[PDB]
Assembly symmetry: C2
Homo-oligomer: 223 residues x 2
């Protein structure tokens, strides 16, 4: 199934997702040092999300490869591929694309639960707090905003190798007729200069709440 | 030479350091994906610091192995080893120890320069700024405190897998008779629970300013 990510992804990318840890999955041998000292719940999400990533790579025509980690934990894709990984309670998902047409991917999944006390204040600009109070529907807008901030960081970081704080992007939401999905824009408030290619002044994505999960995706195209 | 790190390291660890990038050094094949998309100055520090790490491992009786990156970029050491890496303008250094007697290592090097405008206020508790004004010597105490905070994070993170912010530790310095080296204590202000072993309520290290560099080291022993 591509049920949940199909509601946020445009064309030019492949995806895979699961909602549990299939028993007895293994990392590739090359990946073993990344999780040798990890707690079992970290091991599980690492292994299961890379099973999803190798399925998605296969839909691109790319054979199963180790997916290692680099600067600040960013995934290391095979030559000619960009992508993003996510895992939370009840979700693992991977999205990949060819770097010939896709510049960056960021995705994130969150359980559709209220944020813990104090978290909203720590992740919002004043203006975002005002905006969220005006958004329609029985949704955890705090959590959806959090999910979109996380996807924004994952799409930004591989293009800049610079920190992007919660106060460094203003996220604004649009809501479709369903009331359970729509678009967002992340307007960058700091130096937008990329390592390669045009400045990152804004990143556009989609959000969707379904099956107890918020998902967000940003797919920035190569021009 | 072990010149600069010899002024901050206790027993039970091996180290290696250089002040430039020896030309023609290569990553090991397994490390290539971590720097395949990096800018040249990031490749250089990554490659040279792992040359230092493999020398230091050799001093421990450990053969040359890839040093990959895991959660939040932490280095991935061979079974039975802990350690820390640092690189800045004019310095690469690696410190390793056996996990049977060493629990964690965090090291950091900084150019001995004033911090850029605004950085001191972003990295200090109000009380720290007042204490730094009290410390003696023609030293960049702002930079030395920054260097010690970075070492604190590197020692902390592999034991907790939790964020530690600048405001989450109070560092206090003592100054030796030389006026150019001494001890510091990092008092943890958040939940100190470790994943394994006793709580991290405080981390003790040494600092040394020499040859235009600040170096810090924390070596937490296994009991
Ligand atoms: C990196 C971060 C965003 C991940 O958020 P999260 O909700 O825990 O995300 P998930 O657990 O669903 O996904 C983590 C995956 O993201 C990817 N990722 C991690 N660091 C990354 C980075 N620097 N760049 C790109 N992708 C990264 C990894 O593939 C990771 O999974 P893996 O370790 O199994 O390979 C978060 O830990 C973080 O550091 N936040 C601070 C920065 C931020 O949010 N800024 C706000 C910007 S507006
Ligand atoms: C990780 C951090 C401390 C590195 O500081 P820095 O001055 O850039 O350090 P250096 O470049 O000298 O050393 C980087 C090395 O530290 C190691 N390191 C990176 N992340 C690490 C982590 N989570 N845990 C342990 N070591 C880590 C790596 O080996 C890295 O080198 P490599 O990428 O070539 O392998 C910094 O980037 C950071 O994230 N700071 C915010 C957290 C913090 O400082 N809190 C204050 C605590 S009181
Ligand atoms: Mg699919
Ligand atoms: Mg996570
Ligand atoms: Mg998430
Ligand atoms: Mg030595
Ligand atoms: Mg650095
Ligand atoms: Mg440093």
């Amino acid at each position: 199934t591509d049920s949940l990510l199909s509601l946020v992804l445009p064309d030019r990318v492949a995806s895979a997702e699961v909602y549990d840890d299939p028993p007895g999955l293994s990392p590739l041998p090359e990946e073993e040092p990344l999780i040798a000292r990890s707690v079992a719940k970290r091991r599980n999400e690492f292994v299961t999300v890379r099973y999803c990533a190798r399925q998605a790579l296969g839909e691109l025509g790319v054979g199963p490869v180790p997916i290692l980690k680099g600067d600040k934990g960013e995934p290391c894709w095979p030559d000619g591929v960009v992508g993003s990984l996510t895992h939370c309670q009840g979700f693992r998902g991977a999205v990949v694309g060819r770097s010939t047409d896709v510049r960056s991917v960021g995705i994130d999944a969150e359980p559709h639960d209220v944020l813990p006390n104090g978290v909203l204040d720590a992740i919002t600009l004043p203006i975002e707090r005002a905006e969220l109070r005006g958004l329609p529907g029985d949704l955890h807008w705090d959590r959806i905003l959090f999910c979109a901030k996380e996807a924004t960081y994952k799409a930004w970081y591989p293009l800049t190798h610079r920190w992007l704080g919660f106060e460094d992007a203003h996220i604004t939401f649009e809501v479709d007729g369903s009331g359970t999905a729509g678009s967002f824009r992340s307007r960058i408030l700091i130096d937008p200069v990329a390592e390669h290619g045009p400045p990152l002044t804004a990143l556009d994505g989609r959000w969707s709440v379904r099956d107890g999960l918020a998902v967000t995706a940003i797919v920035l195209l190569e021009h």
